[PDB]
Structure 1
Amino acid sequence: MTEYKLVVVGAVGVGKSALTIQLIQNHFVDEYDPTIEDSYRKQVVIDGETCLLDILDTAGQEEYSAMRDQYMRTGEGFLCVFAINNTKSFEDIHHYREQIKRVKDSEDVPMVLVGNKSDLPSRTVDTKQAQDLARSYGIPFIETSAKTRQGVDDAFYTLVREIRKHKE
């Protein structure tokens, strides 16, 4: 059983932790909790092969900018979870791209783009904008949801799929 280091960062109010809880114990929390650092290790069967997802739900804030590089180096899988309502989180991906590139020492790395709370009527971030930017970075886009659960399981599957192509 191979373990995969997954670092989850982004903006605040996106519902990063909510997504993980939906996969870990299949539970949805309406109330928001200030997650500083949470370790979620669940064995998931990706494309027939069971892998151990070592997901680290951390806070991508300025107060953790000096510690971010610590886990980003060992991190293999990166879930770029942004919000469709909060267009600012969509622009925050630029800063992350620059940092991750510096921490990984590589421009081409295995990463996935996922938009949470896609079931919200307030869609500020347009699908074309997200899709276009996804191609620029070279990462796939998946519309996720913690309340409605829209292919959340497959979102994690595809993450490993991209990572596998970086090896084999």
Structure 2
Amino acid sequence: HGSLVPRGSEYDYLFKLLLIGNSGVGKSCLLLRFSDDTYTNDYISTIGVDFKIKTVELDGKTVKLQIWDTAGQERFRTITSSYYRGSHGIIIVYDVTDQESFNGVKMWLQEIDRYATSTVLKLLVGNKCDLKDKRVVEYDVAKEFADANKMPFLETSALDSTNVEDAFLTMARQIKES
């Protein structure tokens, strides 16, 4: 007794997102910007895997985003095949001022191709677009790469908020439209 509150399962409209990319590209700062609207100049390298839950509204419906942050440093990784296979969508992050991080994208895509399902949603993010001064990866170059791999592409800055919400909502929409 007494009043029924109609409820569904714990995992109803819970979308699982995975952030992958080289160390230093800004995966953790992107997540912190999106979830807390906060930022740090500090480079505190992520150990293993961790998640945050961000609740958003899409087309008048509330969906929970379970976003997994990952170690970019190999010596700190715990990520296992199931993390790829258990994700609805994967965001690959590079740093537009770091050619090596962008070269690493092909290898990250091959990790997804190895361990994720053929149908996993993908999004390419070139971070640190606030560093216009230090850009080494041209938009048109990354865009052509993304196009050839049939995935959307956004440039972002965790520092000044540019496209951050858009990146995560883009992926959320990709999963919801699925």
Asked whether the two chains share a fold, i.e. TM above 0.5, the reply is yes
* Alignment map for 1:48-87 (pairs within 5 Å): 48-63=60-75, 67-87=79-99
Paired position in structure 1 for 2:24: 13
Identity, in percent, stands at 36
**Alignment RMSD:** 1.8
1:144 is aligned, of 129, 135, 156, to: 156
Q: Distance in 2 between matches of 1:17 and 1:64?
A: 14
Q: 1:30 aligns with which of 22, 41, 48?
A: 41
In structure 2, how many angstroms separate the alpha carbons of the residues matched to 1:33 and 1:61?
A: 11
Query: 1:15-65 CA distances to partner (integer Å, 9 max, x unpaired)?
Result: 111111112111111111111122111111234322111111011443467
Runs of 4+ in 1 over 6 A off after TM superposition: none
- Name the larger-Rg structure: 2
Pairs aligned (count) = 165
Give the stretch that moved more between structures: 112-121 or 31-40: 31-40
2:97 and 2:122 mapped to 1: Cα distance? 22
TM-score by length of 1: 0.89
Superposed CA deviations along residues 75-134 of structure 1, whole A, max 9, x for unmatched, are 11111111101111111111111121121241x531111111101010000111101000
Question: Structure 2 counterpart of 1:79, which letter?
Answer: I
Q: Which runs of 5+ in 1 are unaligned?
A: none
- In structure 2, what is the Cα distance between the partners aligned to 1:68 and 1:61? 14
**Which deviations, in whole Å up to 9, do the C-alpha atoms of 1:145-166 show, x marking residues without a partner?**
111111211211111222234x
Tell me the equivalent position of 1:128: 140
Distance verdict in 2 for CA 1:38–1:67, change over 3 Å:
closer
